[PDB]
Amino acid sequence: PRYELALILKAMQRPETAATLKRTIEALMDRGAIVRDLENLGERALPYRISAHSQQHNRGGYFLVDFYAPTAAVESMVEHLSRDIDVIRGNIVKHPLTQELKECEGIVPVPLAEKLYSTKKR
Amino acid sequence: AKHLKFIARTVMVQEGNVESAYRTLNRILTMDGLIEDIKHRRYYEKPCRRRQRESYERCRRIYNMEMARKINFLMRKNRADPWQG
Amino acid sequence: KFSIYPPIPGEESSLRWAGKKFEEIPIAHIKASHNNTQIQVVSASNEPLAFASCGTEGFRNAKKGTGIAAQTAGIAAAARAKQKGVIHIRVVVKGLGPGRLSAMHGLIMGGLEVISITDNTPIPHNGCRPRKARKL
Amino acid sequence: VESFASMLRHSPLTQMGPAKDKLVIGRIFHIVENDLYIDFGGKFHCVCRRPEVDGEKYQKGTRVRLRLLDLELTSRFLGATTDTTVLEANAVLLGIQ
Amino acid sequence: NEDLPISMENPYKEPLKKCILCGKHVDYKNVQLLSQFVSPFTGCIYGRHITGLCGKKQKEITKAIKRAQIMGFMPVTYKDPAYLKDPKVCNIRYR
Amino acid sequence: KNVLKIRRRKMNHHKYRKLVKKT
Amino acid sequence: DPPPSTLLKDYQNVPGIEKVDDVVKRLLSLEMANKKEMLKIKQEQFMKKIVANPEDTRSLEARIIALSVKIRSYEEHLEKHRKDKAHKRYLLMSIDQRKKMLKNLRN
Amino acid sequence: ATPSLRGRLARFGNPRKPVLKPNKPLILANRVGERRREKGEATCITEMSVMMACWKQNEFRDDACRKEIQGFLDCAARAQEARKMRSIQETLGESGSLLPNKLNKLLQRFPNKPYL
Amino acid sequence: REVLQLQEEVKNFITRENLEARVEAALDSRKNYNWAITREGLVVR
RNA sequence: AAAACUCCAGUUGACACAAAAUAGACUACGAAAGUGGCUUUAACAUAUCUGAACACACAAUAGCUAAGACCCAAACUGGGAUUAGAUACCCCACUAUGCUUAGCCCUAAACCUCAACAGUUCAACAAAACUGCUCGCCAGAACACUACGAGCCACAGCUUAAAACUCAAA
Ligand SMILES: [Mg+2]
Ligand SMILES: [Mg+2]
Ligand SMILES: [Mg+2]
Ligand SMILES: [Mg+2]
Ligand SMILES: [Mg+2]
Ligand SMILES: [Mg+2]
Ligand SMILES: [Mg+2]
Ligand SMILES: [Mg+2]
Ligand SMILES: [Mg+2]
Ligand SMILES: [Zn+2]
Numbered sequence: 001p002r003y004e005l006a007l008i009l010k011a012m013q014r015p016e017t018a019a020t021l022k023r024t025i026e027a028l029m030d031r032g033a034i035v036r037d038l039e040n041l042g043e044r045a046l047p048y049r050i051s052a053h054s055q056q057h058n059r060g061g062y063f064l065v066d067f068y069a070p071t072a073a074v075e076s077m078v079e080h081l082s083r084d085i086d087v088i089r090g091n092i093v094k095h096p097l098t099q100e101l102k103e104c105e106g107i108v109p110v111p112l113a114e115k116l117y118s119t120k121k122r
Numbered sequence: 123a124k125h126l127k128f129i130a131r132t133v134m135v136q137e138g139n140v141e142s143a144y145r146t147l148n149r150i151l152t153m154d155g156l157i158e159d160i161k162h163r164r165y166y167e168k169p170c171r172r173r174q175r176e177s178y179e180r181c182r183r184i185y186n187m188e189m190a191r192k193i194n195f196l197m198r199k200n201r202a203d204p205w206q207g
Numbered sequence: 208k209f210s211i212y213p214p215i216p217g218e219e220s221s222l223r224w225a226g227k228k229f230e231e232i233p234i235a236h237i238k239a240s241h242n243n244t245q246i247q248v249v250s251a252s253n254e255p256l257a258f259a260s261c262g263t264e265g266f267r268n269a270k271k272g273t274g275i276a277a278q279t280a281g282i283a284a285a286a287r288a289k290q291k292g293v294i295h296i297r298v299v300v301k302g303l304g305p306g307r308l309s310a311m312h313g314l315i316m317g318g319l320e321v322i323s324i325t326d327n328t329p330i331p332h333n334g335c336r337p338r339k340a341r342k343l
Numbered sequence: 344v345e346s347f348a349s350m351l352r353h354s355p356l357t358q359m360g361p362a363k364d365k366l367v368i369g370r371i372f373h374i375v376e377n378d379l380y381i382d383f384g385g386k387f388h389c390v391c392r393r394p395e396v397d398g399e400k401y402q403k404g405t406r407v408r409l410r411l412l413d414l415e416l417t418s419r420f421l422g423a424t425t426d427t428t429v430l431e432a433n434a435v436l437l438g439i440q
Numbered sequence: 441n442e443d444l445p446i447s448m449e450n451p452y453k454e455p456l457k458k459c460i461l462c463g464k465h466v467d468y469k470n471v472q473l474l475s476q477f478v479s480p481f482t483g484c485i486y487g488r489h490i491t492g493l494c495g496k497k498q499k500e501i502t503k504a505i506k507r508a509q510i511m512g513f514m515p516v517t518y519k520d521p522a523y524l525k526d527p528k529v530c531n532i533r534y535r
Numbered sequence: 536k537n538v539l540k541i542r543r544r545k546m547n548h549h550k551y552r553k554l555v556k557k558t
Numbered sequence: 559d560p561p562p563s564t565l566l567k568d569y570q571n572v573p574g575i576e577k578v579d580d581v582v583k584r585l586l587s588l589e590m591a592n593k594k595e596m597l598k599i600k601q602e603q604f605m606k607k608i609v610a611n612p613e614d615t616r617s618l619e620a621r622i623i624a625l626s627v628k629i630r631s632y633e634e635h636l637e638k639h640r641k642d643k644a645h646k647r648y649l650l651m652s653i654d655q656r657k658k659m660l661k662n663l664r665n
Numbered sequence: 666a667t668p669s670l671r672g673r674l675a676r677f678g679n680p681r682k683p684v685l686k687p688n689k690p691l692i693l694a695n696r697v698g699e700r701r702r703e704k705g706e707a708t709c710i711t712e713m714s715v716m717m718a719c720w721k722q723n724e725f726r727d728d729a730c731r732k733e734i735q736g737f738l739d740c741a742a743r744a745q746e747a748r749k750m751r752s753i754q755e756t757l758g759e760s761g762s763l764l765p766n767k768l769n770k771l772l773q774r775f776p777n778k779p780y781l
Numbered sequence: 782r783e784v785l786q787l788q789e790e791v792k793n794f795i796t797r798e799n800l801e802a803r804v805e806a807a808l809d810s811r812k813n814y815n816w817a818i819t820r821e822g823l824v825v826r
Numbered sequence: 827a828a829a830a831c832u833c834c835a836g837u838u839g840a841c842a843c844a845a846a847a848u849a850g851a852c853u854a855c856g857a858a859a860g861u862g863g864c865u866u867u868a869a870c871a872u873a874u875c876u877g878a879a880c881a882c883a884c885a886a887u888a889g890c891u892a893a894g895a896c897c898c899a900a901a902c903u904g905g906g907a908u909u910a911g912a913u914a915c916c917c918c919a920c921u922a923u924g925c926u927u928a929g930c931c932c933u934a935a936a937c938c939u940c941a942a943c944a945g946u947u948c949a950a951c952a953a954a955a956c957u958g959c960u961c962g963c964c965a966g967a968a969c970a971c972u973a974c975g976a977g978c979c980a981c982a983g984c985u986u987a988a989a990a991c992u993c994a995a996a
Contacts, residue, residue: 001591003866008512014808021804025795034585035795038807041469041814047515049124051840060512063808064469068585074866091511091865096467104463106456107494110669112419116676117690118954119424121780123839128229128297129518130481131326132213140311143324146211149534151326154484159847160303160328165340166899174686176850180668181687183851187667188420188693192427192777193768195418198390199429200763200771202375211535212480215521236837245836253838260835268827278714299837312711332847332863335898336924342915349443361452421670422692422779460822472815478848485849489666495852502849503864510864527819541935548971555982574784579791582784593868616873628871635868643884644856648871650883651857655872668851675938676953683938684853690953 002036002095003074004066007081008088010052011043011059020086021063031076033069040064052088060088066095213323224295224322232322235284235296235314239304243271246280246310248288248296257287261306277306281313289318298324356385362414362432368406368440381407381434385414389434400439409436459493460529466497468504471513472523477501477530480519486530560599562589567598593631600627618663625656695776699765708744712737 009020021038028035041062049058069077074092081090133147151157167175214220214229224232231251238245248257261276264283270276288296296314298321300307311321351357359365362385369383379401382388389411393401401407416429466473478485485505488498508514565575565586575583588595604623605612614620632649636642675683715733723729758764795803817825 006511018804018808021808022800025800025804029797034581036790037793038795038803040807040810040812042811046512047520048126048512050512056840062513068590070590071867078866089512093468093507093865096465101465104458104494106458106462108456110671112421112667113670114419114424116670116674116953117422117692117779118948118952119779119781120954125515125517127327128213128323128325129215129521130483131328132481133324134209134211134213135322135324136209138315138320140315140321140324144308144311146534147324147326150481153532153534154479154482155848156328156330156482156484157303159330163331163337163847166337167340177685177687180851181685181691184421184668184670185691185693187851189697191418191667192420192693193697195416195427196429196771196775197763199431199775200767201378201390204373204375204380212521212524217521234837238836247836249837255837258836275710275714278711282718316711316715330847331845333845334847335845336900338899346443348445352443420693420777423777424779424781427775427777458822460818460820464818464822464824467814469814470816472817476817482848484847487849487851489851491849498849498852505849507864526817527825529818529820543968544971547969551972552982558982569784572784574788578784578788581791581794582788585787621872625871632869632871638868642869645869647857647883648869651871653871658872666851669853672853674953675940677940679938679953681853686938 001068002066002098003033003069004064004093004095005077006089006091006093007063007065008046008060008090009063009086010055010057010088011061012086016086017061020084024081024084024087025065027077027080028065028067028069028073031069031073033067033073033077035065035067038063038065050088053085057088224320227295229297229322232295232297233288233293235298235319235321237298237300237307237310239300239302239307239310241272241304242268244277244280244304244306244310246277246284248284248293256291256293257284259283259287272305274306274309277304277309278313278316280306281310281315282317285314285317285319293319295320295322297322300324300326300328302328359384362411364410366408366410368408370404370406371401372403374401374403381409381436383409383411383434385432387415387430387432389432391434391436394436397439405439407436407439409434409438411435459497461497461501462494466501466504468507468511469513471508471520472526474501474505474508474514475519475523476526478505478519480524483515483517483519490530490532492529492531560588560596560603563587564599566591566595567602597627597631618659622656622659622663625652625659629653629656692779693777695769695772697765697768697772700759706744706748709737709740712740 007024009017025035041064043059043061046058046060049056050060078090078092081087084090131147131151133143135143148157214222216230220229222229233251233256234249236247236249243261245260246258247255249255259280261271261273261280264276264279266273266276266279296319298311298314300310311324314321367383369381369389371379372382372388373380378390378392380388380390389409391409411432411434414432416431416433417426419426468474477491485502488495491498505514509516514520563584565583566588569575569586575586584590588599601620601623602612604627605620608623609617609619611617615624629649629652632645632652635645636649639645670685672679672681673684675686712733716730716737719726719730719733727734754760815826819825
């Protein structure tokens with residue numbers, strides 16, 4: 001099935017960022033994945049500080065990938081990007097649009113429940 | 123901690139109105155349900171009596187909301203009796 | 208027109224105090240609790256300016272956790288702050304307590320100007336288990 | 344001879360439809376010093392407050408135009424086997440004649 | 441006979457009202473929307489009676505909020521200051 | 536409701552525990 | 559135990575499987591998807607090998623082969639998770655129902 | 666706006682477990698609860714704080730304490746006048762919040778019934 | 782009909798030689814998913 | 827109030843095998859026990875029903891066996907208080923333990939005390955009264971979650987389970 005990799009790496013220059021990206025895609029191909037496309041979210045200041053493998057980082061580059069891969073590729077890539085230092089975080093998830101949206105007909109009015117108690121004068 | 127300071131749970135003073143600042147602060151905290159949580163987490167709350175408190179609070183909310191609905195529904199009826207005899 | 212929200216290091220902040228930006232203003236810190244409240248004043252760069260407490264004022268176990276003791280501690284800390292040359296202050300409060308609301312009035316009477324009030328009280332997301340409930 | 348079914352099919356209410364968001368003309372039959380009760384149509388009268396403008400221009404037989412929400416105010420609560428009523432009808436007025 | 445009623449549906453039926461997001465899609469990346477759906481100061485998630493949307497969408501957006509928080513797109517304590525000058529959907533009373 | 540029989544069983548079981556602790 | 563590269567169940571009537579690219583055939587292979595695709599391919603193989611009339615799930619033999627493939631799935635899951643009491647109970651109940659229907663089929 | 670109670674209580678047709686477990690049966694009562702006090706009155710604390718300050722500075726010099734001692738006395742008198750004012754206010758009727766007596770009167774002029 | 786979409790999208794699928802151009806193009810480009818919605822349900826960017 | 831710590835406390839920076847605010851006014855999953863931080867994997871029986879106390883598989887917390895884990899809480903214990911006395915309620919410190927592994931024990935007010943299946947419209951209290959079929963259970967109180975006997979990795983136990991004497995009540 002489809003797998004979206006959300007990638008958050010440290011703020012650094014285009015050459016080494018592209019090096020990290022190409023080696024990650026090489027790891028995908030080695031595991032046997034097929035990349036659909038690459039999406040750049042861009043560089044942004046992180047909301048909260050993070051302690052990486054060896055440092056702390058306040059700014060970070062957000063990238064996103066979508067690809068196809070088997071199951072074991074998931075864990076293999078998780079451990080790969082965990083051993084990787086340039087990446088701050090990497091998370092694999094599934095595609096939302098693959099879950100076809102159930103057709104909605106609006107919100108039904110909930111009538112107040114009744115007959116919880118018997119007819120008694122008390 | 124590692125989050126930035128002076129964004130959350132803040133309130134800016136205007137014209138040195140410290141009392142109104144703290145009033146707005148505790149109002150928003152209670153509307154978010156924070157002072158309640160703090161005073162309850164002072165001591166540990168067992169799951170059983172937690173569930174009991176929670177169910178009682180649900181029923182209390184239900185009864186109070188329905189009473190308020192009927193009060194707002196019947197406030198207009200409280201007027202000068204037109205037909206005395 | 209007034210914005211209740213505080214400023215941000217990213218521009219723009221159109222409000223200074225004594226010709227200074229919001230960030231570099233000193234911080235008053237308050238640690239409130241049942242039996243005692245501890246107050247401190249620190250610079251923007253972590254440099255502790257003034258520190259005092261109800262115990263240093265000379266209040267006893269029953270009376271450390273009161274509003275009058277908090278007011279006195281605020282008066283003393285404001286005296287120290289005015290001696291060292293501090294006028295404006297950003298307030299930070301931590302925890303519940305009787306003298307919580309009273310420390311601010313104490314500082315004001317001492318002669319400081321609180322510009323903002325921040326409540327960095329501890330809230331655990333079910334992190335740790337507190338003590339067991341008392342049976343009064 | 345005409346059946347009640349025919350008279351209902353040609354009735355003013357079947358052509359009126361939903362009472363909400365509809366104008367209607369009416370008159371008053373009883374009026375207290377502070378409020379006035381308009382008999383406009385259907386079963387119930389609608390009680391209303393005297394407006395600040397043109398206060399004295401409200402007497403018996405005055406034809407006032409006004410809208411209405413429903414011809415009967417009711418509501419069912421948690422312990423109400425039969426819904427509480429008001430014996431009245433909510434309405435808002437914005438003109439006369 | 442002809443004037444009599446007949447079994448028939450009610451065309452006065454008001455169509456079932458739909459929440460602002462009943463039809464639209466939600467993701468863990470629309471930090472703008474997911475910050476509109478949370479308290480600005482404390483970071484607490486506004487409940488259903490504050491928000492005013494259906495339970496399915498509330499569940500989706502709250503799970504997405506938690507995912508973004510743990511992922512890094514959003515903080516946990518303080519709402520992002522840049523998203524404050526946006527439409528206020530969630531009703532409140534303190535101001 | 537009343538729990539007198541429950542308390543009877545309670546004291547029976549407690550006395551039995553004590554008896555077994557002794558013997 | 560079908561191969562991994564075998565395309566999915568649904569994409570068999572279409573004649574575009576040969577003309578389409580090799581990467582497309584690969585991503586259409588059932589090895590990419592979850593194992594329930596593999597399981598339905600298996601039960602189709604069994605029904606084509608055994609049953610005279612396929613496309614008849616109401617049949618006792620179809621129910622039996624479905625439960626057998628599900629039982630082997632649960633067996634593999636338990637062998638990977640020796641501690642999964644829920645799936646163990648499900649497997650036991652499934653074997654019991656399978657024996658019940660084998661009995662009534664023999665009858 | 667109100668929360669539903671379809672399958673919250675333990676009912677016969679309710680298959681799953683119950684959500685709510687109220688001690689008493691939940692039926693709309695025909696009387697409203699009566700108002701309560703808020704806390705124990707307190708005031709003039711800052712006034713007597715200034716007084717004690719000036720006292721310990723000037724060794725009980727009343728002609729110099731005049732300002733804050735007068736302020737303290739005036740604040741005590743104001744607080745007592747305010748107590749009398751809020752008392753007569755509660756007697757004449759709370760503004761915005763109607764009185765429980767007349768509310769109960771209305772509810773018993775048109776009460777709810779759980780029975781037929 | 783469903784096969785044809787992902788059949789044509791194979792051209793969009795990157796590969797090894799397309800990598801050293803698509804990476805640069807993507808990192809040079811910028812894209813966001815953020816968008817809000819008002820009371821009535823109108824999208825706003 | 828005492829006792830305890832001052833290698834104490836406040837701000838700031840780095841850091842966990844611990845438990846997972848708000849959402850949740852939601853009522854969903856699981857047969858039950860139970861499950862509400864995030865991602866991935868596998869997966870959520872039976873298209874007549876009932877059905878083993880001759881079986882099998884589970885079975886909260888607590889407890890046991892051998893390694894490990896240490897924020898916090900805490901049986902026990904110690905000390906300080908109160909009390910005529912306090913082996914407790916209050917306070918401080920700490921331990922088994924609560925946690926991850928491979929096993930064992932197999933009990934709860936395990937109750938929503940309301941059996942499963944297919945359906946309909948009055949003793950009192952409680953959660954209105956009922957119909958057709960099916961399995962299980964009950965026969966005055968107490969002796970009795972007991973004795974004897976039989977089985978269990980359990981050896982202060984668990985399951986099954988009486989009898990004698992006494993009373994006219996319970
Ligand atoms: Mg009860
Ligand atoms: Mg909650
Ligand atoms: Mg254990
Ligand atoms: Mg230990
Ligand atoms: Mg239970
Ligand atoms: Mg039972
Ligand atoms: Mg049964
Ligand atoms: Mg027992
Ligand atoms: Mg025994
Ligand atoms: Zn919706």
